[PDB]
Design a protein around this nucleic acid. Structure first.
Ligand code: NA
Ligand code: NA
Lengths: 99, 101
DNA sequence: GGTTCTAGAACC
DNA sequence: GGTTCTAGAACC
């Protein structure tokens, strides 16, 4: 099936080293971080996910079955992941499904 | 030398006979612990005998495991998901790369 | 179960 | 060779 532009855009954005101050791969490449959501919403969303806020962006991640990664024991930092959303493996996006 | 905690955990997760309480995720990238009260009663005494649930989870944290949660209806039993990029179904040799953090 | 002891590894 | 770290065993 055709890979949703949402996922391709998201993957390219994460993978761009120049955006890493706001969104980047984890060291393992298995997850990605979103930093400083106040800034992320002003700088990033308007250009790559037009007419979105953080809530609608995160709703889309949930729709594609992304999970959140948190520390077991307790800038803002939120970590998301999908087993087919991986550093340097864009072709795996094909295996991501709605719901 | 891989710490016994990690080798025992990997074997325990992998064992189909314990899957009602502890098992791999479908992808093999994470494991689930179900029904922690029962896990503490049936599993910990046999596999991690000097531990309680708190110390078991502390050891996971010490080795850099994280928790996986849904982006936000209660399930029949509680379900906690843990993961480490070197703790994977079918890849026990990767435990060699797990370090204290 | 938490703390202490120590052999041996990790790292320089 | 010297220092720190770590895992397992004893001690509480
Ligand atoms: Na980036
Ligand atoms: Na199991």
């Amino acid at each position: 099936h055709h890979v949703p532009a949402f996922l391709t855009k998201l993957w390219t954005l994460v993978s761009d080293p120049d955006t890493d101050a706001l969104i980047c791969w984890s060291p393992s490449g298995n997850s990605f971080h979103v930093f400083d959501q106040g800034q992320f919403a002003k700088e990033v969303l308007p250009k790559y996910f037009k007419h979105n806020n953080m809530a609608s962006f995160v709703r889309q991640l949930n729709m594609y079955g992304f999970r959140k990664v948190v520390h077991i024991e307790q800038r803002d930092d939120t970590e998301f992941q999908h087993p087919c959303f991986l550093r340097g493996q864009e072709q795996l996006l094909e295996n991501i499904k709605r719901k």
